[PDB]
Design an enzyme around this catalytic site. Structure first.
Site, short mmCIF file in Angstrom:
data_model
loop_
_atom_site.label_atom_id
_atom_site.label_comp_id
_atom_site.label_asym_id
_atom_site.label_seq_id
_atom_site.Cartn_x
_atom_site.Cartn_y
_atom_site.Cartn_z
N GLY A 48 0.81 -1.21 0.00
CA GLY A 48 0.00 0.00 0.00
C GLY A 48 0.84 1.26 0.00
N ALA A 49 0.92 1.93 -1.16
CA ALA A 49 1.69 3.16 -1.30
C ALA A 49 0.83 4.40 -1.21
CB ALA A 49 2.41 3.16 -2.62
N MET A 50 1.17 5.31 -0.32
CA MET A 50 0.23 6.36 0.00
C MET A 50 0.94 7.62 0.53
SD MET A 50 -3.20 6.54 2.43
CE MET A 50 -2.24 6.57 3.92
N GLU A 51 0.09 8.57 0.90
CA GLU A 51 0.37 9.96 1.20
C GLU A 51 0.97 10.39 2.57
OE1 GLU A 51 -2.22 13.04 0.43
OE2 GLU A 51 -3.36 12.05 -1.14
N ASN A 52 1.05 9.45 3.51
CA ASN A 52 1.18 9.76 4.94
C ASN A 52 2.08 10.96 5.30
OD1 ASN A 52 -0.01 6.99 6.28
ND2 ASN A 52 1.17 6.56 4.42
N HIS A 94 4.32 13.56 -6.84
CA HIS A 94 2.90 13.45 -6.54
C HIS A 94 2.67 13.39 -5.04
CE1 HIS A 94 -1.37 12.38 -6.98
NE2 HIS A 94 -1.15 11.28 -6.27
N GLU A 95 3.33 12.47 -4.34
CA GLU A 95 3.06 12.30 -2.92
C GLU A 95 3.67 13.42 -2.09
OE1 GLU A 95 1.29 9.41 -2.29
OE2 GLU A 95 1.59 8.56 -4.30
N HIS A 143 1.18 16.27 -2.08
CA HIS A 143 0.07 15.79 -1.30
C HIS A 143 0.24 16.21 0.12
CE1 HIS A 143 -3.10 13.83 -3.39
NE2 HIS A 143 -2.35 12.90 -3.95
#
Ligand SMILES: *[C@@H]1O[C@H](CO)[C@@H](O[C@@H]2O[C@H](CO)[C@@H](O)[C@H](O)[C@H]2NC(C)=O)[C@H](O)[C@H]1NC(C)=O
Ligand SMILES: *[C@@H]1O[C@H](CO)[C@@H](O[C@@H]2O[C@H](CO)[C@@H](O)[C@H](O)[C@H]2NC(C)=O)[C@H](O)[C@H]1NC(C)=O
Ligand code: NAG
Ligand code: NAG
Ligand code: NAG
Ligand code: NAG
Ligand code: NAG
Ligand code: NAG
Ligand code: NAG
Ligand code: NAG
Ligand code: NAG
Ligand code: ZN
Length: 860
Positions: A269-273, A305-306, A309
């Site tokens: 799970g690759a995400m914004e944290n 992108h991140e 964010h």
């Protein structure tokens, strides 16, 4: 029975801070839970209503202000909305901080959602464990009981006691850690800035690190030890992008730390944290020598992108998910907007351009849904996670920001940022920070609510008659009765008349028809400069034959983005019928004198949709005569390509585009040039460098021989580089031996030599080319049941298996078959967005053949 029958939490109680203590052992996949929530009432309630799932709670109970003495309440729960309610020993009176404590049992997820864990193997042997978090959109409540909505922001101390070897990481920098008696360590992290329940993050696993201190905040990329060596570019890039978000947002990254991590799994799970950006191992590891332009371009934007964010999404979060498209839209814009001012050498506008094209022709279908409207359940919360909304959103901001200046855009951005930092917002709030445009309000952003609220996009027709610019509008619909479809439209236009002097100007059409007066009397006008505006422009007939004539003279009087725009448009229109197909192809008769990649690839895109549609119908000869005439326009550019990696990114992506066009279709020296390069490479047990630019091409040509096929199969199941193994898989599926083509799919499905994640990429590839075309679709229907087991119905892979198996059909016999097959299992499936969009694409092909199969006979 439970005290709350809604899905949104009550406005009754509000968290002010969370304290969280946890014992996962990664080896037995179980964990300690302990949460202390410093809440606060705003209105009287007998209960605290809050979210919690998968928790086996031992002891839980409730304080007030007043006393360090604590007193026993009991939980009630309601698993349908993930909610639990604590029945309070006494009335929560408005205005008072109370603090709530929960103990719990739980399982560590074995999916890859929530607080998940997995295993991997070493370079040296070894079984390693690892665990992480993925809390978007509604997963935080599975890890720890909380108010799991994005409006309910708070501050966080997370403390995680982890074995000696593992490096525990989380949002805030690690304040303290203190040895415990058994051999276990206890890590504690600082209290978090104000942030949303879903952005909390924490990692346990054996890594190393690589750091650098931009100004004050220090940037580090964490990877599994093996080769932390190649997070070197990731690191250097986070660095310049970090003080590129910088100054532009005119806000400083609030944290002391910023750490990016390459999680060693493909379902990561690759995400914004905040302060703890996640990635899949793949998307971060980059090497200056062996890796192509594509994977730099991809790793650069993935970082960019991140990173935006941070400001967008975390700093300023959504009130609710009905607005997700805003941030992900804006981030997606920054991703392409940062890059072309720091890394102007990547030509990252070209990616962007093409990204907009593919956005519009699926925003033109009727399956399309306008990006903003009420959400109320969670099939409706994850329905919002389609990157079509993101990219369309992205398109609107580029159109908004070139209409208003870039500066005007910036401060209204900056002004937006300052006014509700650390706060939740709704969509229109950004439009209001903009209406501090001008000296203060010269036009309204009621404009943007026409684009957000209506599906599709306007078709702008332009006619011109000696003074003029007659501009009219309608929804771009793909044919066979509503009209309050109206757009407020920025009409950039550029011309040339007098002396070769380029005049360009802006004008906002806000009714069904309008007109703009030009100064000079031009020979050609072009509308929508650089496709800045999200729309299609159609001309009257000798306004179209103005530009084309002008392109054969001197085409460089326009940008390459404009030229690519005409080619996009003229072809998609001739699909919708509003132009004969034969004046699209006379537009690109220009292409003898083209040298910029953007228009050549877009023309090659177009021509080859036509090639393939024809080829699947029997009309093979028509198809083949089609490409060879494209080939002849582009004949010099093709031969003059060197089989290298030399040059600007742009001229490399052009090189790779021209070279396997000419090879896919066997045109000139190209197939041989390639097949020598393949034997040398295969001679050498793989031990020879292929220019990565021609690597996928060279692989294809060689995959056409049983010797060659079997070599490349050994190299797939052996070599480590996941980049090059997709250029090998591609080739393996670009065989024309049906038996192999079947066996690839049959095996990827069973997870044999190819993990099942790649089957969707296999299936699309097999079916796209004549020999595999029916074979693909039959595989899809013969194992439909096991396809739904490992990709949940409506997910973005059962997505493509149907899209990419069927989108090439063009007969009403096929159309019947597709629809007969899908209704024959379920009707609940049969009216999936994916399925009747699948059906919708097929008649559009029939329509396309019905209008353009034509007379391909009298030309072509
Ligand atoms: C999970 O449970 C295991 C088993 O109780 C704990 O295990 C030990 O692991 C260390 C090295 O990491 C060894 O030196 C010990 O000999 C192991 N003991 C046993 C009994 O297997 C492990 O620490 C637990 N995980 C956590 C995070 O506490
Ligand atoms: C990441 O690795 C780097 C080495 O490249 C570590 O850097 C130094 O780390 C020590 C350990 O705390 C500090 O005392 C030094 O001040 C750091 N060097 C400089 C020049 O400041 C870094 O600590 C590692 N990451 C972590 C989380 O420890
Ligand atoms: C939520 C809110 O306060 N909205 C207002 C908006 O209605 C007004 O038109 C604008 C003028 O700048 O200021 C802001
Ligand atoms: C968790 O497991 C079951 C409930 O499903 C129960 O028997 C057990 O006592 C629970 N453990 C604790 C520590 O509450
Ligand atoms: C605690 O409650 C008081 C009023 O009861 C409030 O003024 C104060 O802000 C609360 N504490 C914090 C840290 O906000
Ligand atoms: C973990 O899963 C098991 C079933 O495999 C279940 O019995 C148990 O209650 C779960 N743990 C919690 C805390 O609910
Ligand atoms: C470094 O210091 C502060 C950041 O808080 C800022 O004012 C200054 O411009 C920064 N300089 C550079 C080169 O980043
Ligand atoms: C602050 O938000 C309000 C909405 O209540 C808006 O009217 C105002 O223009 C905003 N101010 C700035 C500087 O963004
Ligand atoms: C166009 O020109 C006419 C005069 O010829 C004028 O009345 C009209 O307002 C002009 N329109 C615009 C948009 O400038
Ligand atoms: C492409 O077009 C012509 C060459 O035929 C020339 O005027 C122009 O500068 C070329 N541009 C590039 C980037 O090579
Ligand atoms: C080719 O290289 C692989 C290692 O990548 C090795 O295992 C294999 O035995 C080599 N083949 C020959 C014929 O030497
Ligand atoms: Zn994002």
């Amino acid at each position: 029975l439970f005290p709350w029958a809604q899905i949104r939490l009550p406005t009754a109680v509000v968290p002010l801070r969370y304290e969280l203590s946890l014992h996962p052992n990664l080896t037995s996949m179980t964990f300690r839970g302990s949460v202390t929530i410093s809440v606060q009432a705003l209105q009287v309630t007998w209960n605290i209503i809050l979210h919690s799932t998968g928790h086996n709670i031992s002891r839980v109970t409730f304080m007030s202000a007043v006393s360090s003495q604590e007193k026993q309440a009991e939980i009630l729960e309601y698993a349908y909305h993930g909610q639990i309610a604590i029945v309070a020993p006494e009335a929560l009176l408005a205005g008072h901080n109370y603090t709530l404590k929960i103990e719990y049992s739980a399982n560590i997820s074995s999916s890859y959602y929530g607080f998940y864990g997995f295993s991997y193997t070493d370079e040296s042997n070894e079984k390693k464990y690892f665990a992480a978090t993925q809390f978007e959109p509604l997963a935080a409540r599975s890890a720890f009981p909380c108010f799991d909505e994005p409006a309910f922001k708070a501050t966080f101390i997370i403390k995680i006691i982890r074995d000696e070897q593992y490096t525990a990481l989380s949002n805030m920098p690690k304040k303290s850690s203190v040895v415990l008696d058994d051999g276990l360590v206890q890590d504690e992290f600082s209290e978090s800035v104000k942030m949303s329940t879903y952005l909390v993050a924490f990692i346990v696993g054996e890594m190393k690190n690589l750091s650098q201190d931009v100004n004050g905040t220090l940037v580090s990329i964490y990877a599994v030890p093996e080769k932390i060596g190649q997070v070197h570019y990731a690191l250097e890039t986070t660095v310049k992008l970090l003080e590129f978000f910088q100054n532009y947002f005119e806000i400083q990254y609030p944290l002391k730390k910023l750490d990016l991590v390459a999680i060693p799994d493909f379902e990561a799970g690759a995400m914004e944290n905040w302060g703890l950006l996640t990635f899949r191992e793949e998307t971060l590891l980059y090497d200056s020598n062996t890796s192509s332009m594509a994977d730099r371009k991809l790793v650069t934007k993935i970082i960019a992108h991140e990173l935006a964010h941070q400001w967008f999404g975390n700093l300023v979060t959504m009130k609710w998910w009905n607005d997700l498209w805003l941030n992900e839209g804006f981030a997606t814009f920054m991703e392409y907007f940062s890059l072309e001012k720091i890394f102007k050498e990547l030509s990252s506008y070209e990616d962007f351009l093409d990204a907009r094209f593919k956005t519009m022709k699926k925003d033109s279908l009727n399956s399309s849904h306008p990006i903003s409207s009420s959400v109320q359940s969670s099939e409706q919360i994850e329905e919002m996670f389609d990157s079509l909304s993101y990219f369309k959103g992205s398109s609107l901001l580029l159109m908004l920001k070139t209409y208003l200046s870039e500066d005007v855009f910036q401060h209204a951005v900056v002004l937006y940022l300052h006014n509700h930092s650390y706060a939740s917002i709704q969509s229109d709030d950004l439009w209001d920070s903009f209406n501090e445009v001008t000296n203060q309000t010269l036009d309204v952003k009621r404009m943007m609510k026409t684009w957000t609220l209506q599906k599709g996009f306007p078709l702008v027709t332009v006619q011109k008659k000696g003074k003029e610019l007659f501009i009219q509008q309608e929804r771009f619909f793909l044919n066979m009765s509503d009209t309050s479809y109206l757009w407020h439209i920025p009409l950039s236009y550029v011309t040339e008349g007098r002396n070769y002097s380029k005049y360009q100007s802006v004008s906002l059409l806000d009714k069904k028809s309008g007109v703009i007066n030009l100064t000079e009397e031009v020979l050609w006008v072009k509308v929508n400069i650089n496709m800045n505006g999200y729309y299609i422009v159609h001309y009257a007939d000798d306004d179209w034959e103005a530009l084309i004539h002008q392109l054969k003279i001197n085409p460089y009087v326009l940008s390459d983005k404009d030229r690519a725009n005409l080619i996009n448009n003229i072809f998609e229109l001739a699909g919708l019928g509003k132009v004969p197909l034969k004046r699209a192809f006379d537009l690109i008769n220009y292409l003898g004198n083209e040298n910029h990649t953007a228009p050549i690839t877009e023309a090659l895109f177009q021509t080859d949709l036509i090639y393939n549609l024809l080829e699947k119908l029997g009309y093979m000869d028509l198809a083949s005569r089609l490409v060879t005439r494209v080939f002849k326009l582009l004949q010099n550019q093709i031969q003059q390509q060197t089989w290298t990696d030399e040059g600007t990114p742009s001229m490399r992506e052009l090189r790779s585009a021209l070279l396997e066009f000419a090879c896919t279709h066997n045109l000139g020296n190209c197939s041989t040039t390639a097949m020598k390069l393949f034997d040398d490479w295969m001679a050498s047990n793989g031990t020879q460098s292929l220019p990565t630019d021609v690597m996928t091409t060279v692989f294809k040509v060689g995959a056409k021989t049983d010797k060659g096929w079997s070599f490349l199969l050994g190299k797939y199941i052996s070599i480590g580089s996941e980049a090059e193994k997709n250029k090998i898989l591609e080739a393996l599926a670009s065989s024309e031996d049906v038996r192999k083509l079947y066996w690839l799919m049959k095996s990827s499905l069973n997870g044999d030599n190819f993990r099942t994640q790649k089957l969707s990429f296999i299936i699309r590839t097999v079916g796209r080319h004549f020999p595999g075309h029916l074979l693909a679709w039959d595989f899809v229907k013969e194992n439909w049941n096991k396809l739904v087991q490992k990709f949940p119905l409506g997910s973005y892979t059962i997505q493509n298996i149907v899209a990419g198996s069927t989108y090439l059909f063009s007969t009403k016999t096929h159309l019947s078959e597709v629809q007969a097959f899908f209704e024959n299992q379920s009707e609940a499936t049969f009216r999936l967005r994916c399925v009747q969009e699948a059906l919708e694409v097929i008649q559009l092909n029939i329509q396309w053949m019905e209008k353009n199969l034509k007379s391909l006979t009298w030309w072509l």
